[PDB]
């Protein structure tokens, strides 16, 4: 399967739509498709690539930085997140954790 992923940058008021395979991390797909997103560790151990889900679901089982509450609040580490449905997500949300 291939899911549609809508990336929203509220601060800049931009929107990008990309198609991501069910076995590819969002970050990777976005880059390949021409959209650079913030990142640092690239390994699910930091908050640089944080995004916030608006709708849809993902699988970010490889992540380790986010606690359960953050997860419940909809936060996602885009560098290790696989879409499990069509998703709409807000990017550049790191600030939200401080
Ligand atoms: S870039 Fe560090 S968790 Fe994604």
Domain of residue 29: give its range.
Answer: 1-98
Question: How many CA within 13 A on the CB side of residue 36?
Answer: 1
Q: Do 59 and 80 contact (CB within 8 A), yes or no?
A: no
Q: Which of 46, 66, 67 to mutate to test the pocket of ligand 1 (most atoms within 8 A of CB)?
A: 46
Q: Which of 48, 51, 75, 93 to mutate to test the pocket of ligand 1 (most atoms within 8 A of CB)?
A: 48
How far is the centre of ligand 1, averaged over its atoms, from the C-alpha of 94 (Å)? 10
Q: Looking at the 3D structure of the chain, how many domains does it have?
A: 1
* CATH code, domain with 36: 3.10.20.30
d(CA 36, CA 85): 22
Instruction: Print the SS3 string covering the chain.
Output: CEEEEEEEECCCCEEEEEEEECCCCHHHHHHHCCCCCCCCCCCCCCCCCEEEEEECCEECCCCCCCCHHHHHCCEEEHHHCEECCCEEEECCCHHHHC
């Amino acid at each position: 399967a291939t899911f549609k992923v809508t990336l929203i940058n509220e601060a800049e008021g931009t929107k990008h739509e990309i198609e991501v395979p069910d076995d590819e991390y969002i970050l990777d797909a976005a880059e390949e498709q021409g959209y650079d997103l913030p990142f640092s560790c690239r390994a699910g151990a930091c908050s640089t690539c944080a995004g916030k889900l608006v709708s849809g679901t993902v699988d970010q089982s490889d992540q380790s930085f986010l606690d359960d509450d953050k997860i419940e609040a909809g936060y996602v580490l885009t560098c290790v997140a696989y879409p499990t449905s069509d998703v709409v997500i807000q990017t550049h949300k790191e600030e939200d954790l401080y």
